[PDB]
Design a protein around this nucleic acid. Structure first.
Ligand SMILES: N[C@@H](Cc1c[nH]c2ccccc12)C(=O)O
Ligand SMILES: N[C@@H](Cc1c[nH]c2ccccc12)C(=O)O
Length: 794
RNA sequence: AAAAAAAAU
């Protein structure tokens, strides 16, 4: 549990294809970079203020300290120069005025750019050197723009509603590769809060055309409170505050302790205070106040604006993200041009600071040779046992039937849509069309539903389900019908998955009224596996050597709340196909990325594997999603030990080979076809299966990019896979082929997906757990015994 | 919730 293995070899499988990546080569001098520390006092100022301080400090002290040198600054403590200041070592104390800060500057170290060069060729990486470069490259944009993490944004106009807005910008990061340093540049866009009076913000949040009223009900108040809680407001009557809460009382009645001349404190209303103190009679005294700072300062809504440049963290409404998707989605050729325009306007080679440090960035995207891997054949069952060949990451189930399809003889219908809109004719039409398709799918639904009724309310689910379970023996499935978003789906699943242990397939009302063969076919895919059926398997002989001996495939992922706990989910294969997965899920610490109870979860799965296959896996392949590079050493430490602990806990001399692989979908590397002949679809993306493990990947470690999916919309994100550990000593080809084939085992669609099925299943499990969430939390997530032997999360 | 992809005082 320590050091990632070196890259074993380079992949050679698949046909070559010319690509270009949004990585721009950096010509970097072999000099030393000089590193100074900065103690600014006070030391809690926002990074922007620190940058203003440093900026003025440099100019004000030109004659005696900085001269013609252009230093760069990281926003906090670290300042760099391309030439050593006349400091030598001894600390100096300074003053700066916007009002008055005390800055001390003290030489710490020499960042060797030569040490970086040799790390790039081999021997064998100074992180602080990479960081020094990053500080240099983003010094200028950090002042001209609004940095968010590693990106930069500005306002243009592009409303999303609810007080939210779209800001366009770009990601920027310096990355090591073999022989070279790379500048990663990609276009980006995120949600920002519109800068406007809080009054208007209230209208957009509560759907008012005009504010012109009467006190908010308890409902309107908590909606608005949730929206503005934690946001920054400024006063119209230049002061900034933090909104910590919205008062229950209106301004005319909300009071606070006010100390008079005698020293005695009395309660005074916010309305009365703003009248005496500011000659201001409140326009809307019936509206509540923003409680700011910390506990008794209150602000009326009409004297506050939402501070500009506030990024939106909270979950977007389904309509908000939609227009965001639409306004941000661009084809691969389109995105490539925007990056070119960005390089041209960023104009790095004329930036004063990178010129100062003698850095040169190339304005041509890096040429990369990729390899398009051959997809696995998909074996089906039924009469003819047809073999499907994915073309452009897609196949279908025409003239084909399930590997093992479940014959349905007993099933029920629970319509929670009103008979008014979902008529008896609809149900009968839906039922008839569903059965025809299912027949063809190799999952024959014989007999009309044993039961079919209507209902309303989440409170009606269990007694209705208690009913069905007790009276209909052999009951396999309850198809539930819902009208749009509604909290009964969560209730249907909670009762179905955790309490009674019954397979339930929810379906929208609209997909019942108007049925299509493709929709029904996709509905049958989920139904079959939820009854323990097997839709299809990888062509057995079209499999890598890893399947020679008992192996279990794990998919782990932790999802964080939109306070509320995080949810860790780990799934594991239960056969040799591999097809069926058992799920383990835990609630854990809010925003804790590491799976705390991993050892226990892995053990459970290992047992389940042994009871299903009567074999102990000789290898454990672990696909870990949702981990940033800055957390590798930490996650690799506890988690590799955790799964190794599970094996020891099982049996003393049980030591299966573990391959620890992190899967990353959240990065900003893009791959584009050099030949226009290689573009696929209207989106013009790279084909399903192109693999990159050269030039732009890690100089020493085992990592590769694999775009396993076909780009339908926008620009494809090629999934990144970084091997943190590998007892099994995989070759580059066999691993890359393995994860690619695993992307063809996702049962919800006849498509190759962007990440391997176990990783995708892990996501679904943790997210199903969210709906299960309506010490007792750990129980509202614990799932019935009979459902476990099914992929209920499918 | 048929489904993948896509922004993310
Ligand atoms: N029972 C399996 C044995 C086996 C071989 N390789 C495996 C990999 C995983 C699980 C089981 C296996 C056959 O069929
Ligand atoms: N305890 C398991 C047997 C077992 C020992 N070591 C294992 C490793 C993996 C799976 C099962 C086992 C049964 O019950």
């Amino acid at each position: 549990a320590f050091k990632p293995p070196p890259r074993p070899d380079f992949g050679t499988s698949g046909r070559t294809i010319k690509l270009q990546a949004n990585f721009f080569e950096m010509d970097i001098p072999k000099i030393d970079i000089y590193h100074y520390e900065l103690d600014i006092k006070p030391e809690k100022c926002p990074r922007r203020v620190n940058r203003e301080i440093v900026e003025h400090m440099v100019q004000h002290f030109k004659t005696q300290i900085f001269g013609d040198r252009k230093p760069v600054f990281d926003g906090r403590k670290n300042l760099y120069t391309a030439m050593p200041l006349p400091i030598g070592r001894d600390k100096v104390e300074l003053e700066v005025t916007l009002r008055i800060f005390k800055v001390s500057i003290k030489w710490v170290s020499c960042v060797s750019l030569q040490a970086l060069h040799d790390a790039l060729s081999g021997r064998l990486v100074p992180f602080e050197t990479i960081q020094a470069l990053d500080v240099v490259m983003r010094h200028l944009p950090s002042m001209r723009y609004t940095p968010v993490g590693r990106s930069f944004f500005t306002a243009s106009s592009n409303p999303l509603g609810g007080g939210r807005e779209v800001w366009f910008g770009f990601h920027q990061s310096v990355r090591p590769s073999l022989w070279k340093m790379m500048l990663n540049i990609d276009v980006s866009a995120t949600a920002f809060y519109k800068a406007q009076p809080v009054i208007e913000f209230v209208c957009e949040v509560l759907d008012f055309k005009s504010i012109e009223q009467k006190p908010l009900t308890d409902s309107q108040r908590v909606k608005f409170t949730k929206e503005i809680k934690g946001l920054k407001v400024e006063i119209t009557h230049k002061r900034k505050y933090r909104v910590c809460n919205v008062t229950r009382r209106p301004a005319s009645h909300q009071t606070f302790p006010l100390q008079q001349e005698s020293g005695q404190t009395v309660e005074c209303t916010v309305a009365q205070y703003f009248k005496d103190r500011h000659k201001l009679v409140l326009r809307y005294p019936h509206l509540p106040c923003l409680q700011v700072g910390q506990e008794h300062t209150y602000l009326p809504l009409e004297v506050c604006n939402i501070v500009a440049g506030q990024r939106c963290i909270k979950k977007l409404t389904d309509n908000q993200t939609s227009t965001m998707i639409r306004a941000t989605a661009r084809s691969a050729p389109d995105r490539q041009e925007e990056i070119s325009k960005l390089m041209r306007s960023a104009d790095f080679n004329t930036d004063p600071y990178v010129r100062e440090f003698g850095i040169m960035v190339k304005d041509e995207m890096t040429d990369v040779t990729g390899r398009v891997l051959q997809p696995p054949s998909i074996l089906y069952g039924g009469r003819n046992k047809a073999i499907a060949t994915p073309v452009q990451g897609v196949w279908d189930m025409r003239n084909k039937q399930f590997h093992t399809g479940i014959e349905i003889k007993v099933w029920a219908i629970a319509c929670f849509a009103p008979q008014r809109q979902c008529t008896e004719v609809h149900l009968k039409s839906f039922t008839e069309q569903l059965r025809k398709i299912s027949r063809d799918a190799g999952m024959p639904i014989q007999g009309q539903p044993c039961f079919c009724k209507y209902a309303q309310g989440a409170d009606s689910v269990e007694p209705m389900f208690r009913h069905l379970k007790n009276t209909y023996a052999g009951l396999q499935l309850v198809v539930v019908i819902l009208p749009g978003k509604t909290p009964v789906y969560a209730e249907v699943k909670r009762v179905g998955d955790t309490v009674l242990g019954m397979a339930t397939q929810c379906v929208q009302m609209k997909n019942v009224q108007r049925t299509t063969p493709q929709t029904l076919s996709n509905l049958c895919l989920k139904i079959n596996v939820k009854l323990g059926g097997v839709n299809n398997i990888l062509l057995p002989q079209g499999r890598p050597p890893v399947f020679q001996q008992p192996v279990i495939f794990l998919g782990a992922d932790v999802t964080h709340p939109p306070k509320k706990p995080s949810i860790a989910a780990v799934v594991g294969s239960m056969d040799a196909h591999p097809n069926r997965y058992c799920a383990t899920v835990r609630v854990q610490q809010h925003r804790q990325e590491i799976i705390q109870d991993l050892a226990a979860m892995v053990r459970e799965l290992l047992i389940q594997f042994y009871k299903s296959t009567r074999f102990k896996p000789t290898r454990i392949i672990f696909y870990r999603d949702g981990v940033s590079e800055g957390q590798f050493q930490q996650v690799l430490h506890h988690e590799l030990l955790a799964i190794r602990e599970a094996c020891i806990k099982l049996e003393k001399d049980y030591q299966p080979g573990i391959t620890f692989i992190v899967v990353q979908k959240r990065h900003h590397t893009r791959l584009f076809c050099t030949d226009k002949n290689e573009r696929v679809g209207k989106s013009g993306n790279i084909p399903a299966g192109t693999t990159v493990d050269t030039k732009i990947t890690h100089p020493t470690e085992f990592d590769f990019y694999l775009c396993s999916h076909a780009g339908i919309q926008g620009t494809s994100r090629p999934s990144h896979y970084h091997v943190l550990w590998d007892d099994n000593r995989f070759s580059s080809d066999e691993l890359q082929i393995l994860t690619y084939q695993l992307c063809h085992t996702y049962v919800r669609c006849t498509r190759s997906v962007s990440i391997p099925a176990p990783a995708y299943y892990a996501h679904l499990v943790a997210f199903r757990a969210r709906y299960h969430l309506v010490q007792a939390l750990a129980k509202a997530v614990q799932v019935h015994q009979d459902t476990l032997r099914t992929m209920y999360f499918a």
